[PDB]
Coordinates of C-alpha atoms and ligand atoms in Angstrom, one line a residue:
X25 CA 37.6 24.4 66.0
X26 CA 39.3 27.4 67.1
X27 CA 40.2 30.4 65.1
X28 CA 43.7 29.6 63.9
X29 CA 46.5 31.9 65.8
X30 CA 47.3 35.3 64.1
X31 CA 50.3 37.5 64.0
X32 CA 50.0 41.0 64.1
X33 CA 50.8 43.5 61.6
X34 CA 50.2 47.6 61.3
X35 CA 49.2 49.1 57.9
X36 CA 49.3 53.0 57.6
X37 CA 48.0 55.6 54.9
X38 CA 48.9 59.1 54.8
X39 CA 45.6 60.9 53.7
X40 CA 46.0 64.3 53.1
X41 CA 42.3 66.2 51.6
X42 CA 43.5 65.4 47.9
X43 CA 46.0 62.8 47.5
X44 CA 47.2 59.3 49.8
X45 CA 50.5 58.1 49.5
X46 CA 50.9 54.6 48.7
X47 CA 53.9 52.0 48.2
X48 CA 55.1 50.2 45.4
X49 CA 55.8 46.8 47.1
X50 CA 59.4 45.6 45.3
X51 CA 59.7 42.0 46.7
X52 CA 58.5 39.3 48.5
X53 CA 54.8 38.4 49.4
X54 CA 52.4 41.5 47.8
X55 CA 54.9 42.5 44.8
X56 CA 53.9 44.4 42.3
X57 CA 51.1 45.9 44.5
X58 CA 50.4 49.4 45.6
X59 CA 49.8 49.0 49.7
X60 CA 50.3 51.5 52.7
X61 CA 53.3 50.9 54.3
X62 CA 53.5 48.4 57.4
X63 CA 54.8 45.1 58.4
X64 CA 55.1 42.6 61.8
X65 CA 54.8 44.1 64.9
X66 CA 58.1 43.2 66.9
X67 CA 58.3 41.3 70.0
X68 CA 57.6 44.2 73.1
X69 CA 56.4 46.7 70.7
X70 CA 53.0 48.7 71.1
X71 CA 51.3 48.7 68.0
X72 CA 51.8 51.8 67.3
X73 CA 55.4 52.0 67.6
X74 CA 55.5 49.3 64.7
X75 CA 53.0 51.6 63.2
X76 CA 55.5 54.3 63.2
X77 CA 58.8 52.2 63.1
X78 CA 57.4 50.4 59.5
X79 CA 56.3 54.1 58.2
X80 CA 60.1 55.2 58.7
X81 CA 61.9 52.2 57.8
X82 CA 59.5 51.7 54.7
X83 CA 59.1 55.2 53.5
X84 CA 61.3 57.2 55.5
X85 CA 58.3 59.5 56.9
X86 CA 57.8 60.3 60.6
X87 CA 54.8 61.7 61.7
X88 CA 52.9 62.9 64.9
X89 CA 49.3 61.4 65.6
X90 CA 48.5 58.2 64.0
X91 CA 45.1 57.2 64.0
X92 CA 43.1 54.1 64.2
X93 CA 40.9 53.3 61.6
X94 CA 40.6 49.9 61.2
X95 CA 41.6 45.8 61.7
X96 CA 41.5 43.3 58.6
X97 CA 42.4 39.6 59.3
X98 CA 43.6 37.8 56.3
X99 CA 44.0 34.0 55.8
X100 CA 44.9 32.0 53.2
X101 CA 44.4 28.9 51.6
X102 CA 46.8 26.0 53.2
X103 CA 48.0 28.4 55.7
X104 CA 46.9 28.1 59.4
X105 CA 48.3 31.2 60.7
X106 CA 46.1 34.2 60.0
X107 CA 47.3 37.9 59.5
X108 CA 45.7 40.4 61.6
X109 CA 46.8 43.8 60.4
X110 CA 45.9 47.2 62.4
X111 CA 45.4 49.9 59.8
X112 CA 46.0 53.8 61.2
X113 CA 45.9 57.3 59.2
X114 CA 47.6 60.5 59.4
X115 CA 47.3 63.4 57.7
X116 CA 50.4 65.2 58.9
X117 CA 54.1 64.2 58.0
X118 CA 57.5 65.6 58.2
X119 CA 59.8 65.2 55.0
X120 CA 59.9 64.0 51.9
X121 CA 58.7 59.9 51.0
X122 CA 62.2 57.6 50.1
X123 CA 62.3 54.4 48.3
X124 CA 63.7 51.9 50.3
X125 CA 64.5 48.1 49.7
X126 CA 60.9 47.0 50.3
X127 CA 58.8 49.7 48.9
X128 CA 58.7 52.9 46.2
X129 CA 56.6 55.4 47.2
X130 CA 53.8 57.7 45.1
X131 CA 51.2 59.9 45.7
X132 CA 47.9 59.3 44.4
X133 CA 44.9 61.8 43.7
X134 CA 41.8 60.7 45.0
X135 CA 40.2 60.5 41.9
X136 CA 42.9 57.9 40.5
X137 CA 43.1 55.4 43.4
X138 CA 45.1 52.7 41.6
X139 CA 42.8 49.4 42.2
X140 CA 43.4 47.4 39.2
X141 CA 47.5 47.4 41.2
X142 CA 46.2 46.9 44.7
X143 CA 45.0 43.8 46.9
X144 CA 41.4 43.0 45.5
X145 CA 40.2 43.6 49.2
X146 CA 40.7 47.1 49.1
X147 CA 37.9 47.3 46.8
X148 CA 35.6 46.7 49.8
X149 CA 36.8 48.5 53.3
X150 CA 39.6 51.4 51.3
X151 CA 36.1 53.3 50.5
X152 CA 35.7 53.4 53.8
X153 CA 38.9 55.0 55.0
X154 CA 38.3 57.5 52.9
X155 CA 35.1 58.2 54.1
X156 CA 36.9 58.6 57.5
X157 CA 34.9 55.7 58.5
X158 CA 36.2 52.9 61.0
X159 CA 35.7 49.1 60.4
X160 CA 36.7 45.5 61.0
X161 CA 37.1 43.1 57.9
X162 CA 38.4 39.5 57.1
X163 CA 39.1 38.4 53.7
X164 CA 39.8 34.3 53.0
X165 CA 42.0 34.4 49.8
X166 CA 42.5 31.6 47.7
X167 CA 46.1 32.7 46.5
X168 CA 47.2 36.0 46.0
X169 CA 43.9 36.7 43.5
X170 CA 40.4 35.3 44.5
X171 CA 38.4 35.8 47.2
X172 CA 36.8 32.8 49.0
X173 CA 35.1 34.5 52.0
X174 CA 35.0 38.0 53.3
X175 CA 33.5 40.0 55.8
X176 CA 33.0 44.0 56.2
X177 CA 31.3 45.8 58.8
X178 CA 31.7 50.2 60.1
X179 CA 32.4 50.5 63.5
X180 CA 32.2 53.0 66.3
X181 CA 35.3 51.7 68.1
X182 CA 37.9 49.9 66.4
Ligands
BU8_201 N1 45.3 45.0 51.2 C1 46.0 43.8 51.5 N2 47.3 43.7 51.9 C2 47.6 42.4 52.1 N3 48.7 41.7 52.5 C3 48.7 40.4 52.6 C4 47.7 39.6 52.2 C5 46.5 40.2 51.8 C6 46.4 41.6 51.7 N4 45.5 42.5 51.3

């Protein structure tokens, strides 16, 4: 039948040349997970005014040019409503990260992305944002740790 109905999230990573920052999620759905920092786009919002609205609230950060880098779609297990999260990049902030209600901030080197504490999906397209590549996923979960169904593909556009 038809694709269930999605709601629409942003998801952004500062990526500087050595290290991405990264957010401790404290509560609710994702805790205990390292994640960029995002959340539901609000009713008459552009995308990338959630983009930038989450980033502040979350971390406290503003920032000039955000980037588009990719779109993953999440659904779940007993669920009919599907996530479809917008992930952008910057490289370029203005003061220092604060922990808010919803997330602790860190900075990670490169070398020491922290998988075993992320979503298991980043193990599949976060590669790719750090090869400043842009692609389109969807990930089928089966609870918050196995992985029914997934696709991955690198775009041009997106
Ligand atoms: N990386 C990532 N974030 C997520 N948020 C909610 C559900 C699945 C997720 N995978």
């Amino acid at each position: 039948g038809a694709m269930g109905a999605s709601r629409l999230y942003t998801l952004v990573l500062v990526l500087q040349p050595q290290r991405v920052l990264l957010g401790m999620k404290k509560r609710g759905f994702g805790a205990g997970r390292w994640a960029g920092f995002g959340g539901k786009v609000q009713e008459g919002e552009t995308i990338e005014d959630g983009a930038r609205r989450e980033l502040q609230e979350e971390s406290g950060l503003t920032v000039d040019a955000l980037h588009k880098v990719g779109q993953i779609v999440f659904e779940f297990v007993g669920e009919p409503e599907l996530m479809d999260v917008h992930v952008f990049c910057t490289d370029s902030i203005q003061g220092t990260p604060v922990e808010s209600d919803e997330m602790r901030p860190c900075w990670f080197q490169l070398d020491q992305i922290p998988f075993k504490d992320m979503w298991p999906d980043d193990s599949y397209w976060f590669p790719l944002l750090l090869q400043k590549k842009k692609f389109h996923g969807y990930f089928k979960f089966q609870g918050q740790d196995t992985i029914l169904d997934y696709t991955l593909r690198e775009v041009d556009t997106v």
